[PDB]
Design a protein around this ligand. Structure first.
Ligand SMILES: Nc1ncnc2c1ncn2[C@@H]1O[C@H](COP(=O)(O)OP(=O)(O)OP(=O)(O)O)[C@@H](O)[C@H]1O
Ligand SMILES: Nc1ncnc2c1ncn2[C@@H]1O[C@H](COP(=O)(O)OP(=O)(O)OP(=O)(O)O)[C@@H](O)[C@H]1O
Lengths: 845, 845
């Protein structure tokens, strides 16, 4: 095809243009002509990929009117080629400024009136005074503008620290530094003739600092703003390990650098609601107090700063200028975020840009994507990761899976402290993450204005929904509320690649506005509408040939139709169905890029037997029917890592007709990559109690098991103990039935978490070696339990136990177990941080 | 079809050129060739956005032979613009090279030490403030407009015998627009020790610590931070200033009030020279020791008044008078052209100082500040009229949550805080009401906006500058005419590129009937018509063809109804019809105005039928008929913040006796954004006076109320006390009827200003619970009041009560309150700064 030829020439220009965008993004350009040049080529690049993906889809449909649509694509390619040719000619003067080719400003912090750091300084000073006799690093970690340097300078000037450490050196490390000037700066603290070392190498300069520091007692060295582990390695030569309890206090935005200097870094606190108000009040009114007319909007101002001292200091600058009237302060309270970033591009914007610009080029889009969700809202890590892959941000072709590559992208953001973690799974994996309010405003301002990554759709007080001229340039739409009325305007976005319904309350699509999304946005790759209840599938949903992510709630539909299989590019499938049976009639076995099938009903998979391929990318098959756990299905998914079965566990374990007792559970053991297995039972009216198949038929690589309502006997825990890799066991809704549970010796070699909900169990007995690696034990709503085994005190890995609706004798046994554990720790064993939690606290007085 | 595509091609070029102008305006280089390139590109850009706007209104009107001809004309005009764009790139390639690429001044200014006139009192005021104060480091920022004499006063303060005697060490520091903090610290160190060579490897952190040590060797220090421009610049320098509790002082000079407020919440705004002192300086600078000859004394005082007490203007004209010789005729010629000598012919001294504040202004604030020069010199600019003009011209670009009025008001606050715009009047709440630009800045605005950027051009008939011809009108962008409007309009002017027509005159003129349609005929692309100084006897069909109109203000004595064809101007934001008629009936389809923001009139406006769509941008409806305050009208306007009612308001407060509670006043309570409400009565022949509806019917977010001739009994004032957020209440004559005024306990929880005029009040009883926040209480022409309640003296927040020609008992009560308050202050009670003013001094003294 000649269209392929002009596409290939277009791709060559795209490689140059993308190289220009990457090169221009490596350093922030202050020239407006280059700013508009970057935006112009960034746009023509975006329309270029959208045009080629149209040709790719149309060529795929051609290989597997049609001619008129292909002709229209060719016309788009010709128009794009005319655009790139004029860019290379008219704007060539701007390209030459990027095809071919610094001030050290140490920060200034508060000396007097430091608010809320009285106990953080006390904690860190205690860690500086005590410890080993070797040079120990005490890192203070935090997000941009948290107050690390303010705390470090508070410690540096503390009366106890000054007396403790005879020699105190403050060194300003930064993103860029020269080791020679660092050593000469430290040398200048001690001797005035620094011209003495003009030709002395850095090797002997470091030994010179060794001599200066070792002449007295301890030394404390505050390495401010360390950004890399290489910087600490290169500078630490000057610091001798002469066994004098020497300390190196360090401040950094990087948790990975902090961990390598000390395995327990000191994460700095956020100011409380009263400390934020106290700080803002002091900054604005100085010694005087806030008049009562301004206290009400002022308190809201300090609470909207989310306890970040940088935001409170920046906002107080605007309040000082505006005045002391009530009306002005409510205007600020309604636009706290804008005052931080847009109105102040020199305090908050430049401080955040110090971390954003140091990001890798691929991680920048991942970080800005977190701003699509509402400010202060919890972002599920699994949801965020699946959106990154579906958007194309995760480009990777190594041995690992894309989930594990996007996960350490997120863990890199958390290490950089650009993303905060609110909940962690039992295995330590990130579960729920949230971006700070000012960083979120930076994500909004950068993505919507500077990069056109995504756009908010709203009609607030005065602003309205975007017009036809704006939607023609929009690439991603994120919307929280008023979705049905937004779609009632009949919008038309030709360049829209994603539609994120980030609203928290589930809405219902009217039957007339159900097909609005597929027609408004024909190039939709991502449709995150799990907060929307669709009652019907419309045929236009099956014309989204570019679709890769689709999440949707439903209350009525039961079957995914066969026309849904026309979307060969789909990766993630989330259908939160209120019903009980979800017959997936779509040909999901021909989606070579399919990765996840998540649902809550009993999904019935289509027939695998009859392209001659295998679903090598499919990783999750959650809550499918037990009838579909066939041998052919598990052959089609060699790389499955999570499996879920719901309903009729009776048919999962029943023996076959060939005489062998191994049932459908035997095929599950053939999944060599399986880590998570979930079994949920529904048929309480069945006359046959369920019996667990022997452990040699289980998947031997299973690391997490969840059972609900299965009515297994407690004697089957003995064969759950034979699993070599099981680490998390959660049992809910009397999944185990019986009044007595007596453990056999041994078993559970590496189980770490045991979660128990309501069951008719009354007695529990065990031996010393039953839980060699148990760390967390939880028991909820089991009012029939009499007592807990005393052998739990021998669990060396025990850290926390939670009991609800438990007997007082169980609390007494917990007290004895804790007391024995404390006695063991007093023999030299390190403390495990034992904790006990009984909810509600009003129970038992 | 392809014409719209060609508009996209032109728009792409316009984005590049607009960025070119934005980047070029960031650096005023000496390259003259680039100065002519930016002027040529700017003219093409202006002629391009005009052609694009012509295309926009043509497309809107179309969606027929005349339309086809106009479309062909637009296509030809666009083609000419495109061809002009190609000439820019073909010939001025080098000019674009200089801006897409990138790349002595720290000499302290000279100020006279001797012959300083008019600063004896101001210096003593600041000295008495430096000597006193607290025990920690206090800053005393002197702040004023460019050329005011801050450095002259600061050097005078720096050299008095009292300042020199009291302070241990005094240091002069010249901070500037751009400075290096390292050099400042090395200069302070250079004064204590001359061996500054030894700090080459010493970082700025240890330099600031060295300045701490040097200043801390003794007692007080006074440091004159000259010309500080930023909040950050003060923070980075104050780290070198020790705080040892010895009453250390810092004397800062700055053009920024917001920077001054941060250092001290009570900035010392420098005063302007009086008319006597201005003449004294001029005669001392021109004639030196010799006195002015008597023949030159009369013109000399005339030019001294032209400077408006600014020393910089006096110094500049002094050089002009020296060069121009000493003759009476020449001096009178200078007095007629003072502005020319300030800026046009002396760019060496005056213009550069003005440009220091101007080039630091953000790009959006530059056009906002230059627009303030359109109004006549010394004239008073209303703040609400100025703000609406900025929005109409497009200078305010905003997408956040605030309203465009609040953003533009913040722009006005930024200009005032930069001392580029004076504030002459302030509202009760402290909002800026009337502003005026200083004379030197007005001439700079006119020079920059006529001879450099072509923002606006004035029309006048002087000695040599007659009315401009057709060639000059072909380049005029905005028209500003003060007088001789009918004479200018009689010649049938033809300005096809005029975007504004500001009648900046003060006295109203009646437009001759035969010249009424001349304004719309002359400038078809009129975007702003500020004809509020012109009385129109009739509307014309030519007015309804100004499809680009956004701001329209006009006075009238004959027009009673706005015609329906007025609604053809869908772009209108502000609609002002100041009519002397009793009623105004708006037949125009104002609901179709999607961007309508303000409708203001003095008559009882009768709104048209609303018959889904919502006017989200409408903020003000001003005075309307009571019968039009329906729940349907308020549905279409949810963001209304000011409402006015005029006429027979008994149709508003009447009870719906049919059985429902749907009184027209109850619909007002459904407006959640209302903040100010006005009611004016016209009909007095009701059998009984009206009574207020219950307070829960009032809008809860109401913060200001105003009633006229409503004849409300004083008993129904306590219900106004149940308004939670009310802050200002004002009443004109006969708004309240009766002689006895009594209040319940509590009420008025947030009242701050109360206004009463010419009521029948004679007896007044109140309680301390009704005034928790009251600050202003005026009783103009309420001479029948006997005595003020004693509870008023207990109100801490009370500020001023002003009465003239009051009763003898009222004067005696004022004397008793003043005497008792003075006695209490002498006994240790904290003073509230309460003042009483009596004019003239013949009575009451
Ligand atoms: N407890 C506090 N009281 C008053 N001001 C504070 C406090 N903590 C921080 N600040 C102010 O907040 C701003 C940012 O704090 P700080 O300089 O310590 O940032 P940081 O966490 O070191 O920043 P970076 O991310 O650049 O390393 C500074 O202007 C500082 O004065
Ligand atoms: N009271 C005065 N008597 C005589 N000359 C004065 C007086 N005040 C100021 N001047 C003169 O006015 C001119 C400008 O004043 P000055 O240099 O003090 O300006 P400024 O307020 O510091 O301005 P900028 O905002 O540019 O810093 C100088 O030449 C100075 O000598």
């Amino acid at each position: 095809l000649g269209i392929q030829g002009e596409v290939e020439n277009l791709l060559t220009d795209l490689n140059y243009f993308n190289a220009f965008l990457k090169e221009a993004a490596k350093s922030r350009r202050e020239n407006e002509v280059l700013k508009e040049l970057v935006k112009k080529i960034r746009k023509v690049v975006n329309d270029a990929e959208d045009s080629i993906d149209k040709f790719v889809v149309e060529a795929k449909r051609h290989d597997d009117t049609h001619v008129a649509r292909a002709k229209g694509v060719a016309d788009e390619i010709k128009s794009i080629r005319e655009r790139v040719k004029e860019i290379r000619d008219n704007d060539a003067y701007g390209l030459q400024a990027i095809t071919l080719d610094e001030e050290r400003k140490a920060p200034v912090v508060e000396e007097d009136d430091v608010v809320g750091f009285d106990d953080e300084a006390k904690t860190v000073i205690d860690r500086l005074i005590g410890g080993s006799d070797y040079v120990e690093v005490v890192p203070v970690v935090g997000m941009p503008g948290l107050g690390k340097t303010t705390l470090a300078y508070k410690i540096y000037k503390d009366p106890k620290v000054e007396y403790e450490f005879f020699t105190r050196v403050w060194v300003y490390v930064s993103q860029t530094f020269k080791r020679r000037e660092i050593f000469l700066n430290i040398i200048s603290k001690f001797t005035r003739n620094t011209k003495q070392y003009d030709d002395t190498p850095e090797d002997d300069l470091a030994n010179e600092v060794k001599e200066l520091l070792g002449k007295g007692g301890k030394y404390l060295i505050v390495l401010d703003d360390v950004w890399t582990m290489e910087a600490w390695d290169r500078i630490k030569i000057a610091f001798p390990n002469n066994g004098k309890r020497n300390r190196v206090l360090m401040t950094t935005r990087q948790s990975n650098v902090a961990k390598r200097c000390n395995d327990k870094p000191h994460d700095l606190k956020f100011l409380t609601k009263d400390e934020s108000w106290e700080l803002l009040e002091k900054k604005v009114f100085h010694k005087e107090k806030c008049p009562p007319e301004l206290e009400l909007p002022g308190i809201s101002i300090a609470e909207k700063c989310m306890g970040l001292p940088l935001a409170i200091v920046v906002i107080a600058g605007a309040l000082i200028g505006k005045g002391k009237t009530t009306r002005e302060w409510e205007l600020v309270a309604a636009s706290v975020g804008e005052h931080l970033i847009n109105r102040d591009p020199e305090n908050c914007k430049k401080l955040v840009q110090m971390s954003y610009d140091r990001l890798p080029y691929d991680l920048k889009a991942c970080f800005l994507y977190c701003g699509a969700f509402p400010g202060g809202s919890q972002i599920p890590a699994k949801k965020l990761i699946r959106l990154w892959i579906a958007e194309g941000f995760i480009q990777y072709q190594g041995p690992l899976a894309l989930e594990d590559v996007a996960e350490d992208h997120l863990n890199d953001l958390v290490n950089r402290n650009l993303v905060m973690v609110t909940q962690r799974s039992c295995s330590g994996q990130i579960k729920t993450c949230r971006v700070h309010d000012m960083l979120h405003e930076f994500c909004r301002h950068e993505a919507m204005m500077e990069e056109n990554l995504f756009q908010e759709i709203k009609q607030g007080q005065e602003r309205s929904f975007p017009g036809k001229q704006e939607l023609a340039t929009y690439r991603r739409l994120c919307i929280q509320s008023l979705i049905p009325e937004f779609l009632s305007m009949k919008p038309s976005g030709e360049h829209v690649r994603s539609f994120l319904c980030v609203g928290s309350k589930k809405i219902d699509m009217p039957p007339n506005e159900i097909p609005s999304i597929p027609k408004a946005f024909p190039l939709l790759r991502v449709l995150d509408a799990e907060s929307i209840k669709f009652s019907r599938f419309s045929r236009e949903f099956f014309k989204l040939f570019h679709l890769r992510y689709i999440a949707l709630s439903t209350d009525k539909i039961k079957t995914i139709p066969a026309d849904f299989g026309n979307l060969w590019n789909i990766q993630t499938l989330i259908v939160e169905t209120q019903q009980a049976t979800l017959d997936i009639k779509a040909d999901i076995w021909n989606m070579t890029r399919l990765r996840h099938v998540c649902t809550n009903a009993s999904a019935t998979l289509p027939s695998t037997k009859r392209d001659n391929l295998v679903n090598r990318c499919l990783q999750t098959l959650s809550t499918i029917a037990p009838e579909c756990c066939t041998a052919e299905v598990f052959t089609r998914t060699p790389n499955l890592k999570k499996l879920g079965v719901r309903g009729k566990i009776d048919a999962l374990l029943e023996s076959s007709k060939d005489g062998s007792g191994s049932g459908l559970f035997s095929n599950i053991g053939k999944l060599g990559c399986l880590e998570y297995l979930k079994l949920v039972n529904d048929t309480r009216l069945s006359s046959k109690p369920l019996h667990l198949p022997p452990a040699y038929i289980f998947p031997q690589k299973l690391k997490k098991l969840s059972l609900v309502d299965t009515w297994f006997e407690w004697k089957d825990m003995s064969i759950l103990g034979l699993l070599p890799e099981l680490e998390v066991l959660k049992l809910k809704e009397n999944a185990f039935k019986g009044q007595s549970w007596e453990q056999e010796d041994g078993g559970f070699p590496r189980l770490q978490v045991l979660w128990i909900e309501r069951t008719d169990l009354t007695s529990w007995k065990a031996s010393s070696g039953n839980f060699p690696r148990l760390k967390h034990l939880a028991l909820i709503s089991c009012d029939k339990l009499e007592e807990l085994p005393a052998e739990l005190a021998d669990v060396k890995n025990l850290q926390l136990i939670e009991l609800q609706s438990s007997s007082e004798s169980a609390a007494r046994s917990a007290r004895a177990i804790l007391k024995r554990n404390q006695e063991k720790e007093q023999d030299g064993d390190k403390g495990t941080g034992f904790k006990l939690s009984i909810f509600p606290h009003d129970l038992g007085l």
